[PDB]
Design a protein around this motif. Structure first.
Motif, PDB file in Angstrom:
ATOM      1  N   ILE C  90      23.356 -18.759  26.442  1.00 46.46           N
ATOM      2  CA  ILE C  90      23.122 -19.591  27.619  1.00 46.46           C
ATOM      3  C   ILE C  90      22.686 -20.991  27.205  1.00 46.46           C
ATOM      4  O   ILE C  90      23.161 -21.993  27.753  1.00 46.46           O
ATOM      5  N   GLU C  94      25.018 -24.123  28.107  1.00 49.04           N
ATOM      6  CA  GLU C  94      24.439 -25.180  28.928  1.00 49.04           C
ATOM      7  C   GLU C  94      24.692 -26.551  28.311  1.00 49.04           C
ATOM      8  O   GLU C  94      24.960 -27.524  29.026  1.00 49.04           O
ATOM      9  N   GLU C 154      19.366 -22.537  38.353  1.00 52.84           N
ATOM     10  CA  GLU C 154      20.737 -22.068  38.191  1.00 52.84           C
ATOM     11  C   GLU C 154      21.393 -21.765  39.530  1.00 52.84           C
ATOM     12  O   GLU C 154      22.610 -21.935  39.674  1.00 52.84           O
ATOM     13  N   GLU C 188      27.090 -20.399  35.678  1.00 55.69           N
ATOM     14  CA  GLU C 188      25.811 -20.452  36.382  1.00 55.69           C
ATOM     15  C   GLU C 188      25.543 -19.161  37.136  1.00 55.69           C
ATOM     16  O   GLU C 188      24.410 -18.667  37.151  1.00 55.69           O
ATOM     17  N   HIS C 191      24.185 -16.647  34.836  1.00 55.28           N
ATOM     18  CA  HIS C 191      22.857 -17.033  34.373  1.00 55.28           C
ATOM     19  C   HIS C 191      21.794 -16.724  35.420  1.00 55.28           C
ATOM     20  O   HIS C 191      20.787 -16.067  35.125  1.00 55.28           O
TER      21      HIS C 191
HETATM   22 MN   LIG Z   1      23.026 -22.114  33.403  1.00 51.65          MN
END
Ligand SMILES: [Mn+2]
Ligand SMILES: Cc1cc2nc3c(=O)[nH]c(=O)nc-3n(C[C@H](O)[C@H](O)[C@H](O)COP(=O)(O)O)c2cc1C
Ligand SMILES: [O-][O-]
Ligand SMILES: [Mn+2]
Ligand SMILES: [Mn+2]
Ligand SMILES: [Mn+2]
Ligand SMILES: [O-]
Lengths: 129, 283, 283
Positions: C90, C94, C154, C188, C191
């Motif tokens: 992640i 990102e 997120e 996203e 996440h």
């Molecule tokens: Mn994210």
């Protein structure tokens, strides 16, 4: 003579200094020209796969017809941890040209690499006569 | 205070070069077909299998530390925002490396073998010691020393175990697994180069006193880790009689690790003359 | 102490599921050809072009924060070693998201235009305030509150800017850049689910007193972030007259963020009826 290239890390530039032979550096920005014959010392910067591996500043310096005509040999720096890519930049310059592959070394080179290139380059220049 | 990264304004062009190479070299253990090594794996004795299992678990330990603790601890010490982004990639790929060994384990080994290999990593005093050394500096408050410990992991500690996959490849055994390891070694080289490059950039910002104090620290940390690695190597390779050659590989890579930090090679040629069959397995 | 990760023994199968989805959805900004949107970009007004730049630069700040500080700060709070590995992915992805916006900026806008977007992000009190809020909890010492701030980022903060790319796509403008955003939104969603899932798992380990304290904090933090987002949205979307619908989208995503954390939706159905053309654009 000696024409070498090195990036911002200067691992190849510091090896040329330890050599003690006067040499000219291919600049990071812009073009240059050499008058006397020379040997090229460049590091490899390739990734996955003879398309690349050679620095872009060296490609521009070698695309110059006047500079390419005086190229006599190539010594490549790199790292054995790159598999078959080990110093493959010298293989590209040696294959796509008529020059031979003189020596390989890793990063700044050991004390034996400096002594090996000094004696090898001296006996290679006496061969050009 | 944070401020969105502008990749169109780079303070160090080397950051983009490393980012492009690492992201362009993205891979997952599913890319390597380890199933073809099932016959070759079966031709190893119980001791040869056990050595490979423990060596691989030891590599997973360094990968677990470098991804979970090592790479992440370097983010606050970055000089540019792009260095931070590059570091997140290293932390992720390190997790990919650690998972690749479990994929090899799942394809070749049994559950009982894997549990024995992982239990061995918990009790081995030498493996635990080398982790405690770098972890203390990862979690410390000396940023430049942290980069030295990080580079020594990528360029030296890993290669005590990287020898075996190359040794097997030299014997036409576990060839696909060696290709899997070669993808890791290719990534490790770039990490050790980058982290070492950033260490040299920080060296230029300190005074002459700090520069000399760090050179002493590097030699002290290298030998402290080396003395621990030679004991680690004996306990593993003495049964197969490979200890003396692994020690040459260890000294050979210790010189490379020093050059990544800008220092000169320390061990002579007669002490780093690793068997050429192993070096041919690398390149 | 550390202990090499064993992917053959998972304490939570969700870690492998999320890892496989996140790694399997790997992508890079070079994969999306944004150059085809140059004609469409020329049909935007000076304000409409500037609006897109400010929205994108604001998204870059959230991506930079979540990758450099957010995801890495969740590693010490992980429940399983595989959760740590997922967080490294992640943190890396990102950073890829933040680079995607710079790739779009380089293809469509000029250097002077790009600089104006970044200079605005430094001075905008609403964008800086939302960044200061999540950073305060990321760098704090409250692990469960930190996970709440991550989920709200997120699942809620990001979508105030995701509205515009979907708005252009619904009007057959900047379609290729919208495909890039769909790749970001795809990440996203996983996440916010994963971080929210782990937040729920941690909730079961504390007592009811702490559990009620976190529900109060979640509602309080959502109200603080929501009130700040409407001012952020007004100052940006009031010129194009899209404010009323973005607020519907905000409540639509605020319900998603709350449900990701195990809490019930707060805004009713008649308050989240965002424009159907925008919801269809996310498909
Ligand atoms: Mn994210
Ligand atoms: C992105 C990148 C790719 C590299 N690829 C190779 C390679 O394919 N083969 C090799 O032998 N060395 C490779 N290297 C190692 C460099 O060639 C080596 O560090 C060299 O000494 C760099 O020279 P310089 O520091 O003087 O610029 C690579 C290094 C980087 C950063
Ligand atoms: O994708 O994380
Ligand atoms: Mn690794
Ligand atoms: Mn590494
Ligand atoms: Mn993102
Ligand atoms: O590894």
């Amino acid at each position: 003579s000696l024409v070498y290239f090195s990036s911002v890390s200067e691992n190849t530039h510091r090896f040329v200094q330890k050599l003690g032979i006067p040499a000219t550096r291919i600049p990071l920005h812009g073009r240059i020209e050499v008058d006397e014959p020379y040997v090229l010392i460049l590091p490899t910067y390739g990734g996955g796969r003879a398309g690349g591996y050679v620095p872009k500043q060296v490609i521009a310096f070698l695309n110059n017809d006047h500079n390419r005509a005086q190229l006599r040999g190539v010594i490549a720096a790199g790292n054995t941890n790159f598999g078959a890519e080990f110093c493959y930049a010298g293989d590209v310059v040696s294959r796509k040209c008529s020059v031979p592959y003189l020596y390989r070394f890793e990063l700044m080179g050991t004390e034996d690499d400096v002594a090996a290139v000094r004696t090898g380059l001296a006996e290679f220049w006496k061969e050009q006569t | 205070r944070v401020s969105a990264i502008n990749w169109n304004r780079l303070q160090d062009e080397k950051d983009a070069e490393v980012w492009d190479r690492l992201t362009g070299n993205f891979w997952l253990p599913e890319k390597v077909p380890v199933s073809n090594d099932i016959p070759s794996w079966g031709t190893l004795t119980a001791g040869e299998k056990q050595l490979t299992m423990r060596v691989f678990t030891g590599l997973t330990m360094l990968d677990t530390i470098q991804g979970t603790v090592g790479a992440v601890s370097l983010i606050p010490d970055a000089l540019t925002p792009h260095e931070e982004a590059v570091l997140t990639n290293i932390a992720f790929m390190e997790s990919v490396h650690a998972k690749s060994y479990s994929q090899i384990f799942s394809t070749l080994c049994s559950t009982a073998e894997i549990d024995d290999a992982f239990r061995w990593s918990e009790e081995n005093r030498n493996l635990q010691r080398k982790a405690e050394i770098v972890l203390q500096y990862y979690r410390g408050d000396e940023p430049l020393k942290r980069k030295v410990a990080s580079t020594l992991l990528e360029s030296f500690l890993f290669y005590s175990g990287f020898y075996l996959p190359m040794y097997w490849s030299s014997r036409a055994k576990l060839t696909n697994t060696a290709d899997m390891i070669r993808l890791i070694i290719r990534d490790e080289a770039v990490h050790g180069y980058y982290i070492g490059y950033k260490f040299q950039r920080g060296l230029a910002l300190v005074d002459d006193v700090t520069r000399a104090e760090l050179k002493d620290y590097t030699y002290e940390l290298l030998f402290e880790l080396y003395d621990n690695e030679v004991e680690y190597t004996q306990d593993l390779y003495d049964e197969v009689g490979l200890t003396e050659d692994v020690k040459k590989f260890l000294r050979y890579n210790a010189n490379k690790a020093l050059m990544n930090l800008g220092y000169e090679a320390l061990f002579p040629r007669d002490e780093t003359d690793v068997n050429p069959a192993i070096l041919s397995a690398l390149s």
